Amino acid sequence: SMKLTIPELSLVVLIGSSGSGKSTFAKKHFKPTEVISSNFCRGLVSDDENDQTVTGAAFDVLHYIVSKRLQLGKLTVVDATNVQESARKPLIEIAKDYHCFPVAVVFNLPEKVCQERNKNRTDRQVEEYVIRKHTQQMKKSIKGLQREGFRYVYILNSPEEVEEVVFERQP
Amino acid sequence: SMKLTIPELSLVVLIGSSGSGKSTFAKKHFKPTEVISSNFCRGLVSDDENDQTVTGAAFDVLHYIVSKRLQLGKLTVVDATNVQESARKPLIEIAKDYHCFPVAVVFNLPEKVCQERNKNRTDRQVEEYVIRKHTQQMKKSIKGLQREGFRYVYILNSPEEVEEVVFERQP
RNA sequence: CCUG
RNA sequence: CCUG
Ligand SMILES: Nc1nc2c(ncn2[C@@H]2O[C@H](COP(=O)(O)OP(=O)(O)OP(=O)(O)O)[C@@H](O)[C@H]2O)c(=O)[nH]1
Ligand SMILES: Nc1nc2c(ncn2[C@@H]2O[C@H](COP(=O)(O)OP(=O)(O)OP(=O)(O)O)[C@@H](O)[C@H]2O)c(=O)[nH]1
Ligand SMILES: [Mg+2]
Ligand SMILES: [Mg+2]
Ligand code: NA
Ligand code: NA
Ligand code: NA
Ligand code: NA
Ligand code: NA
């Protein structure tokens, strides 16, 4: 059992490479409206979830949605890679503005697992160098997450640990 | 600040080398009866907090006290090094027996800091090899703490982070 | 210091 | 994929 305790008013930031299973995990554990996805936001602004050139607009939209949810006291899960500190920073700031608890859930999986999953995907794929970079960035990020402002930091170190997760929401 | 959230019913396990500041930290944040110290227990059984030969008796007494407190629903802080998995295991089990949440607070400080603190102590000192070993064991322990059963894992990565700590005890 |  |  991998029990992850979170407050009812949480901003849950998923941290993981492309192919690490973030979207699958979010669908398993949360309501669809609780999950806001950066790729979905690329689709909202451009019709194309794969379009990297609309990244700025997509994240502007994602951040705006997060802010409205937290204003209204609604638990929110950010489904994006979040492997760069510069990506996490504005999310921590929004949580701070609305007195919300930021939670980090890190998919600390071997690069090989993510590359294999990516190779077999039919929906969307990235190049191998992208997953190599994401995995390196994820690993470098782990130590400093608490200091960034994550009040709960949960690291999942294998697919077996990921599969075992159950969230306990505390009111 | 470094806010560490803990439930009202917690077993707080301090993890750190001799010289890492565990006892000083414990008295800043918790009342005296909330803190049970392994060295104090060596004193209870033998008159000598330094005596390594009475370690079995001392931990038998400490575990018994912890069990009585958790049975009565009283928050308890374990002031011992807790750098070996075999030392943490019985503590996790006692917490489980009494439906208490185990919390890890790790003093991830450089060996050098602990060594210099140790040299300037007038109350009690250990040999250099002891602190070198404890620091290695502490660092090797960090990754696996969640999987051992610690429901919250807090790592303090510098004296500055230690100084910023505020416990938020949740009703 | 759960005992080099 | 917060854009080699
Ligand atoms: N066995 C198993 N496979 C998984 C799991 N999660 C994801 N996968 C596989 O990995 C592929 C990618 O999963 P996603 O959930 O889309 O991964 P992601 O982290 O959202 O990837 P990006 O959206 O590109 O960042 C899926 O199509 C699955 O085949 C899992 O929990 N268990
Ligand atoms: N500057 C500074 N010194 C500290 C701090 N905490 C503890 N010290 C000093 O470090 C020395 C050791 O501190 P303790 O609190 O006894 O450390 P410990 O982890 O309990 O050590 P053991 O009981 O041998 O395991 C003492 O002389 C303290 O005054 C701190 O936060 N800042
Ligand atoms: Mg996805
Ligand atoms: Mg002490
Ligand atoms: Na923009
Ligand atoms: Na792509
Ligand atoms: Na890599
Ligand atoms: Na494991
Ligand atoms: Na260990």
Every domain of chain A and the residues it spans: 1-171
d(CA B33, CA B45): 18
Residues in binding site of A: 18-24, 79, 121, 124
Q: Is B63 exposed, middle or buried (0-12, 13-18, 19+ CB in 10 A)?
A: middle
Give the sign of the dihedral formed by CA A74, CA A79, CA A85, CA A87: negative
Q: Is the CB of residue A20 below 6 angstroms from any atom belonging to ligand 1?
A: yes
B161 and A CB contact within 8 Å:
yes
In SS3 terms, B69-129 reads as: HHHCCCCEEEECCCCCHHHHHHHHHHHHHCCCEEEEEEECCCHHHHHHHHHCCCCCCCCHH
d(CA B125, CA B84): 20
CATH of segment(s) A1-171: 3.40.50.300
State the nucleotide closest to A52 in CA–C1' terms: D3
Residues contacting residue A71 through CB under 8 Å, at least 6 positions apart? A98
Residues contacting residue B159 through CB under 8 Å, at least 6 positions apart? B21, B109, B113
d(CA A100, CA B6): 17
Q: Is the CB of residue A37 below 6 angstroms from any atom belonging to ligand 1?
A: no
Å: A60 CA to C2 C1': 54
**Strand A165-170 relative to strand B10-15: parallel, antiparallel, unpaired?**
unpaired
* Contacting residues of A for B161, CB less than 8 Å apart: 147
Beta bridge mates, A37: A79
CB contact under 8 A, B152 and A152: yes
A155 touches A106 (CB < 8 A): yes
For residue B61, which of B32, B47, B40 has the smallest C-alpha distance? B40
Count the Cβ atoms, other than its own, within 10 Å of residue B83.
23
Calculate the CA A94 to chain-centre distance: 15
Q: Is the CB of residue B102 below 6 angstroms from any atom belonging to ligand 2?
A: no
For residue A6, which of A14, A80, B88 has the smallest C-alpha distance? A14
CB contact under 8 A, B3 and A151: yes
The alpha carbon of A60 and the centre of ligand 5 are apart by a number of angstroms equal to 6
Beta bridge mates, B170: B7
CA dist list (Å): A165 to A3, A42, B72: 6, 29, 30
CB contact under 8 A, A157 and B151: no
Å: B117 CA to C4 C1': 21
Element (H, E) at B154: strand B152-156
d(CA A51, CA A133): 19
Beta bridge mates, A165: A2
Buried b (16+ CB within 10 A) or exposed e, B100-115: bbbbbbbbbbebebbb
The alpha carbon of B144 and the centre of ligand 9 are apart by a number of angstroms equal to 6
Count the Cβ atoms, other than its own, within 10 Å of residue A41.
24
d(CA B142, CA A97): 31
A91 touches A62 (CB < 8 A): no
Given in angstroms, what resolution was this structure solved at? 1.5
B146 touches B153 (CB < 8 A): yes
Q: Is the CB of residue A23 below 6 angstroms from any atom belonging to ligand 1?
A: yes
Indicate yes or no: strand C within 7 A of the C-beta of B118: no
B146 and A CB contact within 8 Å:
yes
Nearest to B146 among A146, A154, A170 (CB): A154
Half-sphere exposure of B102 (CA within 13 A, CB side): 26
A139 and B CB contact within 8 Å:
no
State how far residue A151 is from chain B, nearest Cα, in angstroms. Answer: 7
A71 and B CB contact within 8 Å:
no
Q: Is the CB of residue A16 below 6 angstroms from any atom belonging to ligand 1?
A: yes
Ligand 1 atom 30 nearest Cα: A21
